[PDB]
Scaffold this active site. Structure first.
Site, mmCIF file in Angstrom:
data_model
loop_
_atom_site.group_PDB
_atom_site.id
_atom_site.type_symbol
_atom_site.label_atom_id
_atom_site.label_comp_id
_atom_site.label_asym_id
_atom_site.label_seq_id
_atom_site.Cartn_x
_atom_site.Cartn_y
_atom_site.Cartn_z
ATOM 1 N N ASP A 70 0.837 -1.232 0.000
ATOM 2 C CA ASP A 70 0.000 0.000 0.000
ATOM 3 C C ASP A 70 0.866 1.273 0.000
ATOM 4 O OD1 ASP A 70 0.534 -1.028 2.627
ATOM 5 O OD2 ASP A 70 -1.034 0.242 3.498
ATOM 6 N N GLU A 201 0.083 9.254 10.341
ATOM 7 C CA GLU A 201 -0.993 8.289 10.202
ATOM 8 C C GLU A 201 -1.887 8.303 11.437
ATOM 9 O OE1 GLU A 201 0.314 4.286 9.869
ATOM 10 O OE2 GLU A 201 1.053 4.142 11.929
ATOM 11 N N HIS A 407 -4.044 8.020 6.206
ATOM 12 C CA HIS A 407 -3.887 6.605 6.529
ATOM 13 C C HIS A 407 -4.811 6.214 7.686
ATOM 14 C CE1 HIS A 407 -1.883 2.732 6.542
ATOM 15 N NE2 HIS A 407 -0.908 3.147 5.754
ATOM 16 N N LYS A 455 30.194 41.794 18.574
ATOM 17 C CA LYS A 455 30.961 41.540 19.786
ATOM 18 C C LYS A 455 30.758 42.662 20.799
ATOM 19 C CE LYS A 455 35.034 38.793 20.721
ATOM 20 N NZ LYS A 455 35.841 37.773 19.992
#
Ligand SMILES: [Zn+2]
Ligand SMILES: [Zn+2]
Length: 590
Positions: A70, A201, A407, A455
RNA sequence: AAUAACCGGAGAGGGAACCCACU
Protein backbone atom coordinates in the site's frame (compact mmCIF):
# COMPACT_ATOMS: atom_id res chain seq x y z
CA UNK A 1 3.61 28.86 1.54
CA UNK A 2 2.96 25.12 1.84
CA UNK A 3 0.53 23.26 -0.43
CA UNK A 4 -0.44 19.68 0.40
CA UNK A 5 -2.49 17.49 -1.96
CA UNK A 6 -3.26 13.92 -0.83
CA UNK A 7 -3.92 11.88 -3.95
CA UNK A 8 -4.85 8.99 -1.66
CA UNK A 9 -5.28 7.96 1.96
CA UNK A 10 -7.47 11.02 2.47
CA UNK A 11 -9.58 10.05 5.46
CA UNK A 12 -9.07 6.53 4.12
CA UNK A 13 -6.40 3.83 3.83
CA UNK A 14 -4.34 2.31 1.05
CA UNK A 15 -2.73 3.68 -2.10
CA UNK A 16 -1.09 6.33 0.06
CA UNK A 17 0.34 9.18 -2.00
CA UNK A 18 1.02 12.79 -0.99
CA UNK A 19 2.15 15.77 -3.05
CA UNK A 20 3.96 18.64 -1.35
CA UNK A 21 4.50 21.99 -3.07
CA UNK A 22 7.04 23.78 -0.88
CA UNK A 23 9.05 26.90 -1.76
CA UNK A 24 8.18 26.29 -5.40
CA UNK A 25 9.26 22.64 -5.39
CA UNK A 26 7.07 19.56 -5.92
CA UNK A 27 7.95 16.37 -4.03
CA UNK A 28 5.90 13.16 -4.17
CA UNK A 29 5.84 11.21 -0.92
CA UNK A 30 4.95 7.56 -1.37
CA UNK A 31 3.08 5.96 -4.27
CA UNK A 32 1.30 2.65 -3.74
CA UNK A 33 -1.86 0.82 -4.73
CA UNK A 34 -4.56 -0.72 -2.57
CA UNK A 35 -6.72 -3.80 -2.96
CA UNK A 36 -10.48 -3.78 -3.42
CA UNK A 37 -10.69 -1.54 -6.50
CA UNK A 38 -10.03 -3.90 -9.40
CA UNK A 39 -10.43 -0.86 -11.65
CA UNK A 40 -7.55 1.54 -12.25
CA UNK A 41 -8.95 3.65 -9.40
CA UNK A 42 -6.68 1.63 -7.10
CA UNK A 43 -3.67 3.52 -8.43
CA UNK A 44 -3.28 7.18 -7.48
CA UNK A 45 -4.64 9.71 -9.95
CA UNK A 46 -2.08 11.52 -12.09
CA UNK A 47 -4.34 13.93 -13.99
CA UNK A 48 -3.69 16.57 -11.32
CA UNK A 49 0.09 16.39 -10.80
CA UNK A 50 0.90 16.85 -14.50
CA UNK A 51 -2.41 16.16 -16.28
CA UNK A 52 -1.18 14.65 -19.57
CA UNK A 53 2.37 15.92 -19.97
CA UNK A 54 5.84 14.86 -18.83
CA UNK A 55 6.09 14.15 -15.11
CA UNK A 56 9.73 15.11 -14.57
CA UNK A 57 8.91 18.63 -15.78
CA UNK A 58 6.76 19.28 -12.70
CA UNK A 59 7.95 16.77 -10.11
CA UNK A 60 11.28 16.95 -8.28
CA UNK A 61 11.77 13.67 -6.42
CA UNK A 62 9.90 10.57 -5.27
CA UNK A 63 10.16 9.34 -1.69
CA UNK A 64 9.24 5.84 -0.49
CA UNK A 65 8.71 5.16 3.21
CA UNK A 66 8.67 1.35 3.44
CA UNK A 67 8.09 -1.72 1.31
CA UNK A 68 4.48 -2.46 2.22
CA UNK A 69 2.45 -2.79 -0.96
CA UNK A 70 0.00 0.00 0.00
CA UNK A 71 3.07 2.33 -0.23
CA UNK A 72 5.55 0.80 -2.69
CA UNK A 73 3.15 -0.89 -5.12
CA UNK A 74 2.81 1.93 -7.65
CA UNK A 75 6.53 2.36 -8.40
CA UNK A 76 6.51 0.37 -11.67
CA UNK A 77 3.16 1.82 -12.70
CA UNK A 78 4.12 5.40 -11.84
CA UNK A 79 7.63 5.25 -13.27
CA UNK A 80 7.37 3.04 -16.38
CA UNK A 81 4.05 3.39 -18.22
CA UNK A 82 3.42 6.97 -17.14
CA UNK A 83 7.09 7.81 -17.65
CA UNK A 84 9.47 9.14 -15.02
CA UNK A 85 13.27 9.31 -14.90
CA UNK A 86 13.70 11.43 -11.77
CA UNK A 87 15.33 10.37 -8.52
CA UNK A 88 13.55 7.85 -6.29
CA UNK A 89 14.75 7.74 -2.69
CA UNK A 90 14.29 4.76 -0.38
CA UNK A 91 16.40 3.07 2.28
CA UNK A 92 18.55 0.07 1.41
CA UNK A 93 16.23 -2.45 3.13
CA UNK A 94 13.24 -0.99 1.31
CA UNK A 95 15.09 -1.20 -2.00
CA UNK A 96 16.05 -4.81 -1.32
CA UNK A 97 12.59 -5.90 -0.15
CA UNK A 98 10.11 -4.08 -2.41
CA UNK A 99 11.18 -5.86 -5.65
CA UNK A 100 10.19 -9.31 -4.39
CA UNK A 101 6.82 -8.11 -3.15
CA UNK A 102 6.20 -6.23 -6.40
CA UNK A 103 6.99 -9.33 -8.43
CA UNK A 104 4.68 -11.43 -6.26
CA UNK A 105 1.88 -8.89 -6.63
CA UNK A 106 2.46 -8.84 -10.39
CA UNK A 107 2.15 -12.62 -10.53
CA UNK A 108 -0.97 -12.52 -8.34
CA UNK A 109 -2.55 -9.91 -10.60
CA UNK A 110 -1.77 -12.06 -13.64
CA UNK A 111 -3.22 -15.16 -11.99
CA UNK A 112 -6.41 -13.56 -10.62
CA UNK A 113 -7.24 -10.34 -12.49
CA UNK A 114 -5.01 -10.56 -15.56
CA UNK A 115 -5.19 -6.81 -16.27
CA UNK A 116 -3.87 -6.13 -19.79
CA UNK A 117 -2.21 -2.83 -18.85
CA UNK A 118 -0.04 -4.14 -16.03
CA UNK A 119 3.67 -3.66 -15.41
CA UNK A 120 5.96 -6.54 -16.37
CA UNK A 121 9.01 -8.09 -14.73
CA UNK A 122 11.37 -6.36 -17.16
CA UNK A 123 9.68 -3.06 -16.34
CA UNK A 124 10.03 -3.59 -12.57
CA UNK A 125 13.72 -4.24 -13.14
CA UNK A 126 14.01 -1.05 -15.19
CA UNK A 127 12.17 0.96 -12.53
CA UNK A 128 14.32 -0.34 -9.69
CA UNK A 129 17.46 0.44 -11.66
CA UNK A 130 16.41 4.09 -11.19
CA UNK A 131 16.55 4.06 -7.37
CA UNK A 132 18.84 5.92 -4.98
CA UNK A 133 19.68 4.72 -1.48
CA UNK A 134 19.56 6.56 1.84
CA UNK A 135 21.00 5.56 5.21
CA UNK A 136 19.82 6.69 8.63
CA UNK A 137 20.20 10.43 9.23
CA UNK A 138 22.02 10.85 5.90
CA UNK A 139 21.10 14.22 4.40
CA UNK A 140 20.88 13.74 0.63
CA UNK A 141 20.90 16.87 -1.54
CA UNK A 142 18.25 16.33 -4.20
CA UNK A 143 19.43 19.63 -5.69
CA UNK A 144 21.30 22.75 -4.61
CA UNK A 145 18.58 23.73 -2.12
CA UNK A 146 16.34 20.72 -1.44
CA UNK A 147 17.62 18.05 0.95
CA UNK A 148 15.97 14.97 2.43
CA UNK A 149 16.77 13.25 5.71
CA UNK A 150 15.69 9.82 6.93
CA UNK A 151 14.99 8.42 10.39
CA UNK A 152 14.41 5.08 12.08
CA UNK A 153 10.70 4.24 12.17
CA UNK A 154 10.23 0.53 12.82
CA UNK A 155 6.84 -0.07 11.21
CA UNK A 156 8.80 -2.79 9.46
CA UNK A 157 12.50 -3.35 8.88
CA UNK A 158 13.77 -0.26 7.10
CA UNK A 159 10.69 1.91 7.58
CA UNK A 160 11.63 5.55 7.98
CA UNK A 161 10.25 9.00 8.59
CA UNK A 162 11.42 11.72 6.23
CA UNK A 163 12.21 15.37 6.93
CA UNK A 164 11.91 17.40 3.72
CA UNK A 165 13.68 20.66 4.51
CA UNK A 166 14.36 23.71 2.36
CA UNK A 167 15.95 26.80 3.85
CA UNK A 168 13.97 27.23 7.05
CA UNK A 169 10.71 25.63 5.88
CA UNK A 170 10.47 21.93 6.70
CA UNK A 171 7.83 19.20 6.56
CA UNK A 172 8.09 15.89 8.43
CA UNK A 173 6.25 12.94 6.86
CA UNK A 174 6.09 9.89 9.10
CA UNK A 175 4.10 7.45 7.03
CA UNK A 176 3.54 4.17 8.85
CA UNK A 177 5.53 4.02 12.09
CA UNK A 178 5.51 2.50 15.56
CA UNK A 179 6.42 4.01 18.92
CA UNK A 180 6.14 0.81 20.97
CA UNK A 181 9.37 -1.20 20.68
CA UNK A 182 8.84 -4.68 19.28
CA UNK A 183 10.86 -7.84 19.87
CA UNK A 184 13.15 -7.16 16.91
CA UNK A 185 12.59 -3.52 15.81
CA UNK A 186 13.36 -0.47 17.89
CA UNK A 187 10.91 2.34 18.44
CA UNK A 188 10.88 5.32 16.12
CA UNK A 189 13.11 8.17 17.26
CA UNK A 190 13.40 11.77 16.08
CA UNK A 191 15.16 15.05 16.79
CA UNK A 192 13.49 18.24 18.00
CA UNK A 193 13.25 19.56 14.46
CA UNK A 194 10.26 21.85 15.09
CA UNK A 195 8.80 21.48 11.59
CA UNK A 196 6.08 23.75 10.26
CA UNK A 197 4.01 20.78 9.04
CA UNK A 198 3.83 17.15 10.14
CA UNK A 199 2.08 14.43 8.15
CA UNK A 200 1.17 11.39 10.23
CA UNK A 201 -0.99 8.29 10.20
CA UNK A 202 -4.00 7.53 12.40
CA UNK A 203 -4.54 3.82 11.77
CA UNK A 204 -5.06 3.27 15.52
CA UNK A 205 -5.76 6.80 16.71
CA UNK A 206 -8.81 5.67 18.73
CA UNK A 207 -7.20 2.60 20.35
CA UNK A 208 -4.73 2.95 23.21
CA UNK A 209 -2.86 -0.31 22.64
CA UNK A 210 -2.38 -2.08 25.96
CA UNK A 211 0.82 -3.51 27.43
CA UNK A 212 2.45 -5.45 24.60
CA UNK A 213 4.53 -7.46 27.06
CA UNK A 214 1.43 -8.81 28.80
CA UNK A 215 -0.31 -9.39 25.46
CA UNK A 216 2.52 -11.62 24.29
CA UNK A 217 2.61 -13.27 27.72
CA UNK A 218 -1.00 -14.32 27.13
CA UNK A 219 -0.13 -15.48 23.61
CA UNK A 220 2.70 -17.66 24.93
CA UNK A 221 0.56 -19.16 27.68
CA UNK A 222 -2.04 -20.13 25.09
CA UNK A 223 0.52 -21.71 22.77
CA UNK A 224 2.11 -23.62 25.66
CA UNK A 225 -1.18 -25.08 26.88
CA UNK A 226 -2.10 -25.89 23.28
CA UNK A 227 1.09 -27.87 22.72
CA UNK A 228 0.52 -29.58 26.08
CA UNK A 229 -2.98 -30.76 25.13
CA UNK A 230 -1.53 -32.57 22.10
CA UNK A 231 -3.42 -30.43 19.60
CA UNK A 232 -1.84 -28.59 16.71
CA UNK A 233 -1.22 -24.87 16.26
CA UNK A 234 -1.83 -22.96 13.03
CA UNK A 235 -0.75 -19.31 12.94
CA UNK A 236 -1.77 -17.37 9.80
CA UNK A 237 0.36 -14.27 9.25
CA UNK A 238 1.49 -12.72 5.99
CA UNK A 239 5.06 -13.70 5.26
CA UNK A 240 6.63 -10.29 5.94
CA UNK A 241 6.73 -8.36 9.18
CA UNK A 242 4.70 -9.99 11.92
CA UNK A 243 5.86 -13.46 10.84
CA UNK A 244 9.48 -12.84 11.81
CA UNK A 245 8.50 -11.17 15.09
CA UNK A 246 6.41 -14.19 16.06
CA UNK A 247 9.26 -16.44 14.95
CA UNK A 248 11.79 -14.66 17.17
CA UNK A 249 9.50 -14.63 20.19
CA UNK A 250 8.59 -18.30 19.88
CA UNK A 251 12.17 -19.34 19.14
CA UNK A 252 13.59 -17.60 22.21
CA UNK A 253 10.87 -18.85 24.56
CA UNK A 254 11.28 -22.26 22.96
CA UNK A 255 15.03 -22.49 23.50
CA UNK A 256 14.58 -21.34 27.09
CA UNK A 257 11.91 -23.91 27.96
CA UNK A 258 13.99 -26.50 26.07
CA UNK A 259 10.85 -27.89 24.44
CA UNK A 260 11.49 -30.26 21.54
CA UNK A 261 8.26 -30.36 19.50
CA UNK A 262 9.31 -29.42 15.95
CA UNK A 263 7.91 -26.20 14.52
CA UNK A 264 7.52 -25.37 10.84
CA UNK A 265 7.44 -22.09 8.93
CA UNK A 266 5.59 -21.67 5.65
CA UNK A 267 7.86 -21.97 2.61
CA UNK A 268 7.92 -19.70 -0.43
CA UNK A 269 8.79 -16.38 1.21
CA UNK A 270 11.07 -17.85 3.88
CA UNK A 271 14.08 -18.20 1.58
CA UNK A 272 14.04 -14.43 1.02
CA UNK A 273 12.63 -13.08 4.27
CA UNK A 274 15.21 -14.81 6.44
CA UNK A 275 18.07 -13.96 4.09
CA UNK A 276 17.24 -10.25 4.09
CA UNK A 277 16.59 -10.14 7.83
CA UNK A 278 19.99 -11.82 8.18
CA UNK A 279 21.99 -9.54 5.89
CA UNK A 280 20.38 -6.37 7.30
CA UNK A 281 21.25 -6.69 10.98
CA UNK A 282 22.08 -2.97 11.39
CA UNK A 283 18.42 -2.04 11.61
CA UNK A 284 17.10 -4.59 14.12
CA UNK A 285 17.43 -2.81 17.47
CA UNK A 286 19.79 -3.19 20.38
CA UNK A 287 19.07 -6.73 21.55
CA UNK A 288 19.82 -8.38 18.21
CA UNK A 289 22.50 -5.99 17.03
CA UNK A 290 24.44 -6.72 20.22
CA UNK A 291 23.80 -10.46 20.55
CA UNK A 292 25.02 -10.75 16.96
CA UNK A 293 28.63 -11.03 18.16
CA UNK A 294 28.27 -14.62 19.36
CA UNK A 295 25.37 -15.99 17.31
CA UNK A 296 22.97 -14.63 14.69
CA UNK A 297 19.39 -14.70 15.90
CA UNK A 298 18.09 -15.11 12.37
CA UNK A 299 19.88 -18.43 11.88
CA UNK A 300 17.14 -20.49 13.50
CA UNK A 301 18.06 -23.69 15.33
CA UNK A 302 14.55 -25.12 15.73
CA UNK A 303 12.53 -23.49 12.91
CA UNK A 304 12.69 -25.51 9.70
CA UNK A 305 11.04 -25.17 6.30
CA UNK A 306 7.50 -26.53 6.27
CA UNK A 307 6.32 -29.44 4.14
CA UNK A 308 2.75 -29.86 2.90
CA UNK A 309 2.74 -33.61 3.50
CA UNK A 310 3.37 -33.03 7.21
CA UNK A 311 -0.20 -31.75 7.57
CA UNK A 312 -1.38 -35.27 8.46
CA UNK A 313 1.50 -35.93 10.85
CA UNK A 314 0.30 -36.83 14.37
CA UNK A 315 1.39 -35.37 17.68
CA UNK A 316 1.21 -31.73 18.75
CA UNK A 317 2.72 -29.33 16.23
CA UNK A 318 3.29 -25.62 15.65
CA UNK A 319 3.12 -24.24 12.10
CA UNK A 320 3.13 -20.72 10.75
CA UNK A 321 1.20 -20.15 7.56
CA UNK A 322 0.33 -17.61 4.89
CA UNK A 323 -1.47 -15.41 4.06
CA UNK A 324 -2.73 -13.45 7.06
CA UNK A 325 -5.89 -12.60 5.10
CA UNK A 326 -6.86 -16.22 4.27
CA UNK A 327 -8.40 -15.08 0.97
CA UNK A 328 -6.38 -17.68 -0.95
CA UNK A 329 -5.08 -19.50 2.09
CA UNK A 330 -2.31 -22.01 1.83
CA UNK A 331 -2.97 -21.66 5.55
CA UNK A 332 -6.64 -22.20 4.73
CA UNK A 333 -5.63 -25.58 3.31
CA UNK A 334 -4.49 -26.86 6.70
CA UNK A 335 -7.41 -25.01 8.30
CA UNK A 336 -9.85 -27.03 6.19
CA UNK A 337 -7.80 -30.17 6.86
CA UNK A 338 -8.13 -29.79 10.64
CA UNK A 339 -11.40 -27.85 10.97
CA UNK A 340 -13.25 -30.84 12.42
CA UNK A 341 -10.93 -31.31 15.38
CA UNK A 342 -11.70 -29.29 18.51
CA UNK A 343 -8.24 -29.84 20.03
CA UNK A 344 -6.34 -27.51 17.70
CA UNK A 345 -5.99 -23.76 18.20
CA UNK A 346 -5.73 -20.97 15.66
CA UNK A 347 -4.65 -17.38 16.28
CA UNK A 348 -5.59 -14.40 14.10
CA UNK A 349 -3.28 -11.61 15.33
CA UNK A 350 -4.64 -8.94 12.99
CA UNK A 351 -7.73 -7.36 11.50
CA UNK A 352 -9.45 -9.33 8.74
CA UNK A 353 -10.94 -7.83 5.58
CA UNK A 354 -14.68 -7.38 6.05
CA UNK A 355 -16.89 -9.42 3.76
CA UNK A 356 -14.31 -12.18 3.17
CA UNK A 357 -13.53 -15.60 4.59
CA UNK A 358 -11.48 -13.58 7.07
CA UNK A 359 -14.65 -11.96 8.40
CA UNK A 360 -16.58 -15.24 8.24
CA UNK A 361 -14.00 -16.85 10.53
CA UNK A 362 -13.81 -13.67 12.63
CA UNK A 363 -17.49 -14.13 13.39
CA UNK A 364 -18.15 -17.21 15.49
CA UNK A 365 -20.70 -18.99 13.31
CA UNK A 366 -19.82 -22.61 12.62
CA UNK A 367 -20.97 -22.48 8.99
CA UNK A 368 -18.17 -20.52 7.27
CA UNK A 369 -17.66 -20.67 3.50
CA UNK A 370 -20.79 -24.56 3.38
CA UNK A 371 -18.40 -26.15 5.89
CA UNK A 372 -18.51 -26.03 9.69
CA UNK A 373 -15.52 -24.82 11.73
CA UNK A 374 -15.06 -26.50 15.11
CA UNK A 375 -11.53 -25.76 16.34
CA UNK A 376 -11.00 -22.74 18.56
CA UNK A 377 -10.06 -19.28 17.26
CA UNK A 378 -8.38 -16.52 19.25
CA UNK A 379 -8.50 -12.99 17.82
CA UNK A 380 -5.19 -11.52 18.96
CA UNK A 381 -3.79 -8.09 18.04
CA UNK A 382 -0.06 -7.93 17.26
CA UNK A 383 -0.24 -4.95 14.89
CA UNK A 384 2.87 -2.79 14.52
CA UNK A 385 1.05 0.54 14.13
CA UNK A 386 0.86 3.72 16.22
CA UNK A 387 -1.42 3.94 19.24
CA UNK A 388 -3.13 7.20 20.20
CA UNK A 389 -0.60 7.75 22.97
CA UNK A 390 2.13 7.01 20.45
CA UNK A 391 0.95 9.70 18.05
CA UNK A 392 0.49 12.20 20.87
CA UNK A 393 3.96 11.51 22.24
CA UNK A 394 5.58 11.73 18.82
CA UNK A 395 3.93 15.04 18.01
CA UNK A 396 4.88 16.36 21.44
CA UNK A 397 8.50 15.35 20.91
CA UNK A 398 8.78 16.80 17.41
CA UNK A 399 7.04 19.96 18.64
CA UNK A 400 5.55 20.89 15.25
CA UNK A 401 3.28 23.82 14.45
CA UNK A 402 0.69 22.10 12.24
CA UNK A 403 -0.41 18.50 11.77
CA UNK A 404 -2.07 16.61 8.93
CA UNK A 405 -3.61 13.15 9.25
CA UNK A 406 -3.85 10.41 6.62
CA UNK A 407 -3.89 6.61 6.53
CA UNK A 408 -7.07 5.99 8.49
CA UNK A 409 -10.81 6.45 8.90
CA UNK A 410 -12.69 9.76 8.90
CA UNK A 411 -14.42 9.34 12.27
CA UNK A 412 -11.21 8.41 14.07
CA UNK A 413 -9.59 11.27 12.17
CA UNK A 414 -12.18 13.54 13.77
CA UNK A 415 -11.71 12.20 17.29
CA UNK A 416 -7.94 12.54 17.04
CA UNK A 417 -8.16 16.07 15.63
CA UNK A 418 -10.50 17.17 18.40
CA UNK A 419 -8.26 15.70 21.08
CA UNK A 420 -5.02 17.09 19.64
CA UNK A 421 -6.43 20.59 19.11
CA UNK A 422 -7.73 20.64 22.67
CA UNK A 423 -4.44 19.28 24.01
CA UNK A 424 -1.45 20.82 22.22
CA UNK A 425 -3.10 24.03 20.86
CA UNK A 426 -1.90 23.10 17.33
CA UNK A 427 -3.56 23.51 13.95
CA UNK A 428 -4.91 20.36 12.32
CA UNK A 429 -6.56 19.35 9.06
CA UNK A 430 -8.32 16.42 7.44
CA UNK A 431 -7.74 16.56 3.69
CA UNK A 432 -10.05 14.35 1.70
CA UNK A 433 -8.38 12.63 -1.22
CA UNK A 434 -7.90 15.20 -3.97
CA UNK A 435 -8.29 18.26 -1.71
CA UNK A 436 -5.42 20.74 -1.61
CA UNK A 437 -4.68 22.58 1.65
CA UNK A 438 -2.54 25.73 1.86
CA UNK A 439 -0.66 26.95 4.93
CA UNK A 440 1.35 30.16 5.43
CA UNK A 441 5.11 30.05 5.89
CA UNK A 442 7.58 32.29 7.74
CA UNK A 443 10.37 32.76 5.16
CA UNK A 444 12.83 34.79 7.24
CA UNK A 445 15.59 36.01 4.92
CA UNK A 446 19.16 35.45 6.17
CA UNK A 447 21.83 38.14 6.32
CA UNK A 448 25.55 38.54 6.94
CA UNK A 449 27.11 40.69 9.65
CA UNK A 450 30.48 42.00 10.80
CA UNK A 451 31.95 40.29 13.85
CA UNK A 452 33.17 43.30 15.82
CA UNK A 453 29.85 45.14 15.91
CA UNK A 454 28.12 42.08 17.32
CA UNK A 455 30.96 41.54 19.79
CA UNK A 456 30.75 45.01 21.32
CA UNK A 457 26.95 45.03 21.25
CA UNK A 458 26.91 41.75 23.16
CA UNK A 459 29.45 43.14 25.63
CA UNK A 460 27.12 46.09 26.21
CA UNK A 461 24.21 43.70 26.68
CA UNK A 462 26.28 41.70 29.16
CA UNK A 463 26.85 44.89 31.12
CA UNK A 464 24.01 45.35 33.64
CA UNK A 465 22.15 47.88 31.47
CA UNK A 466 19.70 45.40 29.94
CA UNK A 467 15.94 45.96 29.60
CA UNK A 468 16.82 49.45 28.37
CA UNK A 469 16.55 49.47 24.54
CA UNK A 470 20.10 49.64 23.21
CA UNK A 471 18.69 49.91 19.67
CA UNK A 472 20.89 47.62 17.61
CA UNK A 473 21.64 49.85 14.61
CA UNK A 474 23.64 49.87 11.40
CA UNK A 475 22.75 49.49 7.75
CA UNK A 476 22.08 46.63 5.35
CA UNK A 477 24.24 46.61 2.23
CA UNK A 478 22.33 44.79 -0.51
CA UNK A 479 23.96 43.20 -3.56
CA UNK A 480 20.92 41.02 -4.47
CA UNK A 481 23.30 38.13 -3.63
CA UNK A 482 24.89 38.67 -0.20
CA UNK A 483 22.91 40.95 2.08
CA UNK A 484 25.40 42.09 4.72
CA UNK A 485 24.63 44.13 7.82
CA UNK A 486 27.39 46.56 8.78
CA UNK A 487 28.05 49.33 11.27
CA UNK A 488 27.84 52.99 10.30
CA UNK A 489 31.59 53.65 10.16
CA UNK A 490 32.31 50.36 8.41
CA UNK A 491 29.72 51.18 5.76
CA UNK A 492 31.21 54.66 5.43
CA UNK A 493 34.69 53.30 4.76
CA UNK A 494 33.39 50.53 2.48
CA UNK A 495 31.38 52.88 0.28
CA UNK A 496 33.96 55.69 0.36
CA UNK A 497 31.40 58.37 1.21
CA UNK A 498 32.54 61.39 3.19
CA UNK A 499 31.85 61.44 6.94
CA UNK A 500 29.62 64.50 7.01
CA UNK A 501 29.80 66.41 10.30
CA UNK A 502 26.87 68.52 11.50
CA UNK A 503 27.70 71.19 14.10
CA UNK A 504 25.25 73.54 15.93
CA UNK A 505 26.51 76.55 17.88
CA UNK A 506 23.87 78.28 20.01
CA UNK A 507 24.39 81.75 21.47
CA UNK A 508 23.04 81.58 25.02
CA UNK A 509 22.31 85.09 26.30
CA UNK A 510 22.99 85.46 30.03
CA UNK A 511 21.55 88.59 31.68
CA UNK A 512 23.24 89.16 35.04
CA UNK A 513 25.71 91.50 36.71
CA UNK A 514 28.36 88.81 37.22
CA UNK A 515 31.69 89.43 35.52
CA UNK A 516 32.34 87.94 32.09
CA UNK A 517 35.65 86.42 33.21
CA UNK A 518 33.91 84.29 35.84
CA UNK A 519 31.05 83.39 33.47
CA UNK A 520 32.86 80.32 32.13
CA UNK A 521 33.73 79.15 35.65
CA UNK A 522 30.09 79.63 36.68
CA UNK A 523 28.98 77.60 33.66
CA UNK A 524 31.39 74.80 34.55
CA UNK A 525 30.32 74.73 38.20
CA UNK A 526 26.60 74.81 37.35
CA UNK A 527 26.85 72.08 34.70
CA UNK A 528 28.93 69.83 36.96
CA UNK A 529 26.36 70.28 39.73
CA UNK A 530 23.31 69.73 37.50
CA UNK A 531 24.39 67.02 35.04
CA UNK A 532 25.27 64.21 37.44
CA UNK A 533 27.59 61.46 36.18
CA UNK A 534 28.44 63.62 33.14
CA UNK A 535 31.99 64.32 31.99
CA UNK A 536 32.19 68.01 32.95
CA UNK A 537 35.65 69.56 32.70
CA UNK A 538 37.11 73.07 32.72
CA UNK A 539 39.73 73.38 30.00
CA UNK A 540 42.91 75.39 30.69
CA UNK A 541 41.81 77.96 28.08
CA UNK A 542 38.71 78.88 30.11
CA UNK A 543 36.22 76.85 28.08
CA UNK A 544 33.97 74.10 29.45
CA UNK A 545 33.46 70.59 28.08
CA UNK A 546 30.37 68.48 28.81
CA UNK A 547 30.89 65.15 27.04
CA UNK A 548 31.38 66.51 23.49
CA UNK A 549 29.61 69.87 23.93
CA UNK A 550 31.97 72.86 24.14
CA UNK A 551 30.82 75.98 26.00
CA UNK A 552 32.88 79.11 25.31
CA UNK A 553 32.46 82.59 26.79
CA UNK A 554 32.36 84.62 23.58
CA UNK A 555 33.94 88.03 23.21
CA UNK A 556 32.08 90.89 24.94
CA UNK A 557 29.00 91.98 23.03
CA UNK A 558 27.73 95.52 22.43
CA UNK A 559 25.06 94.97 25.12
CA UNK A 560 26.69 95.39 28.61
CA UNK A 561 23.86 93.45 30.28
CA UNK A 562 24.11 90.46 27.93
CA UNK A 563 26.86 87.83 27.88
CA UNK A 564 27.18 85.45 24.93
CA UNK A 565 27.96 81.77 25.56
CA UNK A 566 28.66 79.70 22.44
CA UNK A 567 27.44 76.16 23.09
CA UNK A 568 28.78 74.10 20.18
CA UNK A 569 27.85 70.46 19.70
CA UNK A 570 27.70 67.73 17.08
CA UNK A 571 24.54 66.09 15.78
CA UNK A 572 25.28 62.83 17.60
CA UNK A 573 25.33 64.56 21.00
CA UNK A 574 22.70 67.09 19.90
CA UNK A 575 20.33 65.69 22.53
CA UNK A 576 22.69 66.75 25.31
CA UNK A 577 23.48 69.97 23.45
CA UNK A 578 19.80 70.90 23.31
CA UNK A 579 19.39 69.95 26.97
CA UNK A 580 22.34 72.18 27.88
CA UNK A 581 20.88 75.06 25.88
CA UNK A 582 17.48 74.65 27.55
CA UNK A 583 19.10 74.57 31.00
CA UNK A 584 21.22 77.64 30.22
CA UNK A 585 18.19 79.53 28.89
CA UNK A 586 17.05 79.57 32.53
CA UNK A 587 20.27 81.44 33.33
CA UNK A 588 23.20 80.69 35.60
CA UNK A 589 22.75 80.74 39.39
CA UNK A 590 23.02 84.23 40.87
C1' A B 1 -1.94 -5.16 3.71
C1' A B 2 -0.89 -10.19 -0.76
C1' U B 3 -0.08 -16.49 -1.48
C1' A B 4 2.55 -23.73 -2.52
C1' A B 5 3.29 -21.32 -10.56
C1' C B 6 6.70 -30.03 -12.39
C1' C B 7 10.00 -28.87 -6.95
C1' G B 8 15.84 -34.65 -11.07
C1' G B 9 8.54 -31.16 -17.06
C1' A B 10 13.63 -38.14 -20.45
C1' G B 11 12.99 -41.06 -25.48
C1' A B 12 15.88 -42.46 -28.35
C1' G B 13 15.75 -42.22 -35.15
C1' G B 14 18.32 -44.48 -40.91
C1' G B 15 19.05 -48.27 -43.92
C1' A B 16 21.31 -51.44 -47.45
C1' A B 17 24.97 -54.46 -49.51
C1' C B 18 29.60 -56.84 -48.88
C1' C B 19 33.59 -59.23 -46.37
C1' C B 20 35.54 -61.20 -41.90
C1' A B 21 35.21 -64.12 -37.23
C1' C B 22 32.78 -67.21 -33.25
C1' U B 23 28.66 -72.41 -32.76
ZN1 LIG C 1 2.47 0.05 6.06
ZN1 LIG D 1 0.00 1.26 5.31
Amino acid sequence: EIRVTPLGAGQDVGRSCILVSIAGKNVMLDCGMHMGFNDDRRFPDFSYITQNGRLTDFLDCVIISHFHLDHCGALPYFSEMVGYDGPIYMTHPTQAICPILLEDYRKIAVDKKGEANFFTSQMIKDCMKKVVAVHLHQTVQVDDELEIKAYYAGHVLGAAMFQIKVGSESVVYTGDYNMTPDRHLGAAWIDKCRPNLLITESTYATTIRDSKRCRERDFLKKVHETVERGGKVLIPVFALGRAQELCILLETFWERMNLKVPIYFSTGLTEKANHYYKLFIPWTNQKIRKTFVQRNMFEFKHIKAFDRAFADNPGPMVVFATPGMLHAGQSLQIFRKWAGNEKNMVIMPGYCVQGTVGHKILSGQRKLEVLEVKMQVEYMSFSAHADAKGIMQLVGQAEPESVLLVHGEAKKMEFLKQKIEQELRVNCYMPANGETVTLPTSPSIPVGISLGLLKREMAQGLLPEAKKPRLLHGTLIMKDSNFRLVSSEQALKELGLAEHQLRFTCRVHLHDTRKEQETALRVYSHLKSVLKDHCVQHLPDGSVTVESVLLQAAAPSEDPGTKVLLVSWTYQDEELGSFLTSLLKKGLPQ
